[PDB]
Design a protein around this ligand. Structure first.
Ligand SMILES: CCC[C@H](O)[C@@H](C)C(=O)NC/C=C\C[C@@H](C)[C@@H](O)[C@H](C)[C@@H]1C/C=C\C[C@H](C)[C@H](O)Cc2cc(OC)cc(O)c2C(=O)O1
Ligand SMILES: CCC[C@H](O)[C@@H](C)C(=O)NC/C=C\C[C@@H](C)[C@@H](O)[C@H](C)[C@@H]1C/C=C\C[C@H](C)[C@H](O)Cc2cc(OC)cc(O)c2C(=O)O1
Ligand SMILES: Nc1ncnc2c1ncn2[C@@H]1O[C@H](COP(=O)(O)OP(=O)(O)OP(=O)(O)O)[C@@H](O)[C@H]1O
Ligand SMILES: Nc1ncnc2c1ncn2[C@@H]1O[C@H](COP(=O)(O)OP(=O)(O)OP(=O)(O)O)[C@@H](O)[C@H]1O
Ligand SMILES: Nc1ncnc2c1ncn2[C@@H]1O[C@H](COP(=O)(O)OP(=O)(O)OP(=O)(O)O)[C@@H](O)[C@H]1O
Ligand SMILES: [Mg+2]
Ligand SMILES: [Mg+2]
Ligand SMILES: [Mg+2]
Lengths: 469, 485, 485
């Protein structure tokens, strides 16, 4: 075998001198043997003098200069196919449940080129989420990319879990969940909820594969784990021909991990200290997620937004790639409007009268124009109060307040925080409800009746309860 | 022989250092034993610096590298029509190999002050707003600028689709051949655009150059220059070409990345200081040649993404300072359903007014200014103040004209059909028609003119100009129809 | 012999460069001939870069350096209880040497997805507002986040003080050993805090780790990790520990200093990019283990200062994105004398609601939502004329409950005592009491309830839950007291 000595160690970065005519190629995986298990290094550069530079998939503590590394002869390769379902995998394809080897027939490199120009396909199927603000104003595309943008704590993980409950067991094919740099607690709670709901059966068939590299992991692992999850999803799409839905909790943690290793590599940073290749890094990850003629891949991607700064290079890079984007605003959540979706910044490719139908497009456009009018007034209203407005403005603002209050919804996964049981609202019921609100038919109802209810029949029931009380 | 070959000393981040290649030219193309191609940017006393067009992953230390002898160049000619190519002119549509009239360098110096000519003949887009208000001539560089999803590509694609009217005729002085460049677009998006151009039979006269976001930053930087060299082959032979760059901003991002990997310090907005020179030397290649130079033309339509409509941002204002004008596409108009959403105030064509179709200039007249006046009046009238006298009248006509300018995607109008529409709108015949019926007016009126007054439309088409008798006949037709409508 | 020893080549900015130490491990600990210690941070083919746990004055070029032979580690065990130590676990109280069960690495990987369990048993703080509104489970991470002087340390100290009602019992599963980490605090402040704990006898079960404002930034960075390693001994041996990181903002500042002196590229707010990795690999170590892992747990309370109350700043949003909720202390409330100043709207416990005492869960009900509604009603009603009956009752009930949640420092209540108070507030029996007499009610009611109805209090404590009979008898007790009161 090709073996090499460690010659430098700098955090996650390890330099290996191979002392022979043949070096490992870039992206090859090398192994070091360790007092517990093994350390995996992925080659990143050739420095010259038979020295390669490599990124470490686990902690480098205890490495010694002169320690012996062996080239495995290929990239990081992960088990793939139906034997991965119901099981939990780390960034290097090992099981991190207790259930023994994964014992799949195939193992496949986590680095691959996107589908060819001839393999592309594209849909305009609306994915009904049951979430009023999404189903009305930013309907998700089945087989498309969805991104959820929000700062810390604004609700995007609760949103993903509501989507998992509503969509994932209704979806006909397999699912893959990748947790990138989020809480190990959230992963354990997800695994328990998957077993309790039955999407995982330890003694039966399972519909979901789980891949985790959480925020306790080194930057190399948090960088590469998304590629393992995506390689499993791509195997289901191409080899099985299945329709997949791929969830990625906090794809920003992949990008940030790219910055961290880049800082150790010693590249000159872009923007606020991000790596160069940020855009091509994102392109190489995000282009593999497409649907193809072989099979559909839906994906829902949460995107943390640092300091809530949507101008941050990583959000701004991600916005270019997504078919639907949902923006969750801290201010809206502080008003108690959950699920905190900003109705105006959230947008979708599918909000097209040729796709949603003319009635839905009309209702959505009139809602958007009403809320944009209210936003335009809000600083005049803040200084002078509502009394300075015109009667047309007073009516438009009262209806805009009712509408934005009505976009709130009790999620079933978050009733612990709201007391109100969860509601699903059908798309047709949503569009009829908001059109009837736009007609002014309910302008006599108090705003509180609109808050946190599951459609207009519930608004009438709540208004009756308030009037009786 | 280290004169004609070299050895890779180091490679990473898509940059390789090579020993030898002593005879290599600056900006030459080299091929690696692993088969990737690369461009020699830096020549240094003991080493060359190569930027890699493919992935580095195939390259290894000690790889043999050999020099092509050619400055980075692409195949050019008529055999690229109907083909989709990468930034290096390799076919990616999966059809057979390309047949080329020759090769042309990617970086070539634009034609100077003497060989150029004034812009004097139209790029007929078939968009009522463009052809009437911001006319584009052959050899113009009209910028398209706006927020994402505001219709920029729809404007460019409808322009390309309109050329099907002339590109089937014999008169190759009228035929306009099209090039479209995808930079940093998804493979999905460009494949769907190809499928659309196939549906409209537009591919048979179109060429598409694609460097998607999957592609290395050197390819995304290079793709506009090689697309320009393809359009220049048509220009230099004496034919007319149009070139669309569906995002120059994504090229500027790719060049910022490449500059950082070359360890060149960033300048304003962290873009490299010569990010202007990157776009300017590109866009100066769009030109109209003199008769001595064979009368050919290349027309450019660069696309820019504004952030929040901020045209003051560095890259927007850089490109505005190059492009002989701009079409500005407004999110407020687009989401209000006024599509193509061209803001008539901020859009201006600095040279295409000399190249507008004369009949359309005659009927349009002040319309470009009148719509801006209407927009100011409407911005005051929305306050609900008293609208007496001309304010009421200007609100009525300005609304109907605005309703007359919106247009369906992939339905470009012939100029003979815009001329009667703009005539009927400008002369106020639509003041009697309610605003919900103006689209019906367009559909039935062109049906009436094309049924009963085809003589007028043929004379408008063939002459491009209204006589006083022809204008009087168009008046009588419009008055009769509005009397019946 | 350069294998086990080396020579300092250079010294500056807290970094010493050393020749030799060929066999040194990455992050091994070394001792300089002056007796200062350093961690070997990065290894190079020629040299080692070492971070000094001390002043640069203590190290000179040409001095000898020795391997200690082990990764940076700290003593751990019950023999640290009652002791104050530096970041390396040397005793600084001067009470003598430390007694240790062993040594544990400072950096060690948090327990994975499978060894964990959901939190299901409370960290009873004895703060009415916390135990009622934002309950903390054992194994939770709960951020305490505040402006300067808003009460953060008082909240943590009262939590530590409350434990002595169980840490003196026999039931080792109810005990909760405490660790407190002082980072960039003044030595005098730490000494006064230790005196405060020791005069309340809270020291016999508490450990304090100090890296004060003068102590080199590498020690301030290291101190939370070694305090975590001390708490992990309890977590891993089936005991329960609570760790307070009394400012993680000051650890982030020390890590920014260390990274910039290493010439690491500054990122947002000039913090290094991996400052999130600094805090998350710390806070992931607080966990509740399964019964296979011995059921132990480590609970963490990090503390953060927000300049100007900006919870949107970089480090606040980072730690909010790591922890399982936050207690937000509002300066406006603290200066209005509402102390402990818990903002009920912006604080939330994202996992500890399952760990709340069921009796408190029963009697609090929607109290958090009611208080959040009350604040917004009172916001307009401060000026709004002609208040309805609904708003009037909202103001009455919310003012009663706001006065009821006020609590004196160092006065944590038992849950047997919190339950009757929260019951009386939520059911509105206070609505007739004068707003200033509620403190009189609180102390006098409990004194009545202790003297007359002790059976109910002992039953609440022993069972932790209210049957319908116990709710009926607590209602009788409350109504008879208010009838007298
Ligand atoms: C430092 C970072 C801050 C960050 O910005 C913030 C998002 C964060 O980090 N954590 C807080 C997250 C959840 C806590 C909530 C579940 C809930 O406890 C509180 C009281 C909220 C407070 C908001 C409005 C009050 C209003 C009367 C409402 O209308 C009250 C209300 C009523 C309701 O009816 C059942 C349902 C609701 O969810 C709410 C509601 O949202 O209130
Ligand atoms: C992407 C950003 C672009 C950038 O923001 C912009 C500055 C830029 O870069 N280029 C725009 C360049 C030329 C366009 C003008 C020549 C002209 O075409 C229009 C209609 C202007 C519009 C302004 C006001 C309307 C008002 C009724 C006026 O008063 C109308 C008017 C009346 C008049 O009387 C005969 C003479 C006039 O010149 C005007 C006039 O200037 O209007
Ligand atoms: N005149 C029009 N009528 C109706 N729909 C239109 C019109 N012009 C554009 N659209 C639609 O608007 C949406 C966005 O426009 P377009 O496809 O041209 O994208 P774009 O502005 O180039 O944006 P991007 O930055 O995503 O490339 C698409 O659905 C397109 O179909
Ligand atoms: N419940 C309370 N009742 C009365 N006074 C209190 C209460 N809690 C805190 N205080 C007082 O308010 C001030 C806050 O002290 P504390 O140690 O909690 O500060 P801190 O918020 O940690 O801030 P800093 O670390 O910046 O000094 C001190 O005077 C403390 O005595
Ligand atoms: N739809 C909702 N209904 C009720 N409560 C909600 C809803 N969305 C969010 N919340 C509340 O807001 C917080 C959301 O936490 P969550 O874990 O979903 O946030 P996040 O955006 O994933 O944060 P992080 O950056 O920490 O990963 C919790 O307090 C939850 O109670
Ligand atoms: Mg989350
Ligand atoms: Mg486009
Ligand atoms: Mg303090």
């Amino acid at each position: 075998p090709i073996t090499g000595k460690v010659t430098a160690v700098i955090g996650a970065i390890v330099d290996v001198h191979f002392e022979q005519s043949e070096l490992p190629a870039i992206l090859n995986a090398l192994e070091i043997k360790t007092p517990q298990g093994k350390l995996v290094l992925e080659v990143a550069q050739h420095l010259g003098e038979n020295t390669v530079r490599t990124i470490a998939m686990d902690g480098t503590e205890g490495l010694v200069r002169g320690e012996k590394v062996l080239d495995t002869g290929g990239p990081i390769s992960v088990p793939v196919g139906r034997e991965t379902l119901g099981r939990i995998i780390n960034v290097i394809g090992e099981p991190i449940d207790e259930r023994g080897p994964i014992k799949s027939k195939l193992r496949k490199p986590i680095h691959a080129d996107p589908p060819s120009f001839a393999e592309q396909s594209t849909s305009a199927e609306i994915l009904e989420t049951g979430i009023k603000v999404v189903d009305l104003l930013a309907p998700y595309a089945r087989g498309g990319k969805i991104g959820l943008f929000g700062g810390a704590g604004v609700g995007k993980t609760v949103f993903i879990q509501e989507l998992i409950n509503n969509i994932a067991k209704a979806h006909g094919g397999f699912s893959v969940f990748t947790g990138v740099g989020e809480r190990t607690r959230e992963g354990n709670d997800l695994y328990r909820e998957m077993k309790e709901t039955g999407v995982i059966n330890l003694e039966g068939e399972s519909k979901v594969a789980l891949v985790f590299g959480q925020m306790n992991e080194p930057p190399g692992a948090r960088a590469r784990v998304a590629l393992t999850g995506l390689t499993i999803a791509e195997y289901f799409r191409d080899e099985e021909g299945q329709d997949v839905l791929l969830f990625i909790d906090n794809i920003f943690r992949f990008t940030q991990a790219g910055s961290e290793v880049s800082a150790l590599l010693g590249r000159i940073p872009s923007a606020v200290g991000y790596q160069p290749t940020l855009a091509t890094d994102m392109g190489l990850l995000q282009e593999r997620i497409t649907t193809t003629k072989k099979g559909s891949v839906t994906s829902v991607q949460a995107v943390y937004v640092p300091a809530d700064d949507l101008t941050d290079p990583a959000p701004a890079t991600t916005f270019a790639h997504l078919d639907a984007t949902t923006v969750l605003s801290r201010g809206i959540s502080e008003l108690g409007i959950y699920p905190a979706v900003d109705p105006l910044d959230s947008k979708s490719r599918l909000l097209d009268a040729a796709v949603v139908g003319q009635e839905h497009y009309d209702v959505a456009s009139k809602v958007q124009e009403t809320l944009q009018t209210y936003k335009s007034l809000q600083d005049i209203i803040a200084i002078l109060g509502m009394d300075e407005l015109s009667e047309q403005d007073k009516l438009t603002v009262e209806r805009a307040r009712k509408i934005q209050r009505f976009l709130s919804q009790p999620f079933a996964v978050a009733e612990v925080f709201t007391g109100i049981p969860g509601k699903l609202v059908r798309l047709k019921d949503t569009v009829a409800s908001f059109k009837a609100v736009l007609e002014g038919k309910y302008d006599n109802i108090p705003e509180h009746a609109f808050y946190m209810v599951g459609g207009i029949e519930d608004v009438v029931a709540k208004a009756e309860k308030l009037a009786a009380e | 022989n280290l004169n004609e070959t070299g050895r890779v000393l180091a490679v990473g981040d898509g940059i390789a250092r090579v020993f030898g290649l002593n005879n290599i030219q600056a900006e030459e193309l080299v091929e690696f034993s692993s088969g990737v191609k690369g461009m020699a940017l830096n020549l240094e006393p003991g080493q060359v610096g190569i930027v890699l067009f493919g992935s580095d992953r195939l390259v290894k230390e000690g790889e043999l590298v050999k020099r092509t002898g050619n400055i980075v160049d692409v195949p050019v000619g008529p055999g690229l029509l109907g083909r989709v190519v990468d930034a290096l002119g390799n076919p990616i549509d999966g059809k057979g190999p390309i047949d080329a009239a020759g090769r042309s360098r990617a970086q070539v110096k634009a034609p100077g002050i003497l060989p150029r000519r004034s812009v004097h003949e139209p790029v007929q887009t078939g968009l009522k707003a463009v052809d009437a208000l911001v006319p584009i001539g052959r050899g113009q560089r009209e910028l398209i600028i706006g927020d994402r999803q505001t219709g920029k590509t729809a404007v460019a694609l409808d322009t390309i689709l309109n050329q099907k009217r002339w590109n089937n005729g014999s008169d190759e002085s009228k035929k306009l051949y099209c090039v479209y460049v995808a930079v940093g677009q998804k493979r999905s998006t460009v494949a769907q655009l190809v499928q659309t151009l196939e549906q409209h039979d537009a591919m048979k006269y179109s060429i598409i150059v694609a460097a998607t976001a999957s592609e290395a930053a050197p390819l995304q930087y290079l793709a506009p220059f090689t697309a320009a060299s393809i359009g220049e082959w048509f220009r230099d032979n004496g034919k007319h070409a149009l070139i669309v760059y569906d995002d120059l901003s994504k090229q500027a991002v790719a060049y910022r990345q490449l500059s950082l990997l070359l360890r060149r310090p960033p300048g304003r907005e962290a873009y490299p200081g010569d990010v202007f020179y990157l776009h300017s030397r590109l866009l100066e290649r769009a030109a109209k040649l003199s008769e001595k130079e064979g009368s050919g033309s290349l027309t450019a339509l660069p696309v820019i993404e504004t952030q929040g409509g901020d045209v003051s941002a560095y890259i927007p204002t850089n490109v505005i300072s190059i492009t002989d004008g701009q079409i500005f596409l407004e999110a407020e108009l687009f989401y209000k359903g006024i599509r193509p959403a061209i803001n008539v105030g901020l859009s201006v064509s600095r040279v295409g007014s000399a190249a507008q179709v004369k009949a359309l200039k005659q009927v349009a007249g002040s319309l470009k200014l009148f719509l801006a006046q209407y927009r100011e009046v409407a911005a005051f009238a929305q306050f609900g103040s008293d609208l007496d006298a001309s304010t009421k009248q200007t609100l009525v006509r300005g609304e109907r004209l605005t309703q007359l300018l919106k247009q369906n995607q992939y339905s470009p109008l012939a100029t003979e059909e815009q001329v009667p529409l703009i005539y009927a709108g400008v002369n106020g015949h639509l003041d009697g028609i309610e605003l919900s019926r103006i689209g019906e007016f367009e559909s039935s009126f062109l049906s009436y003119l094309k049924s009963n007054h085809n003589e007028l439309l043929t004379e408008i088409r063939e002459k491009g100009e209204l006589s006083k008798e022809l204008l009087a006949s168009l008046k009588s037709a419009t008055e009769s129809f509005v009397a019946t409508f």
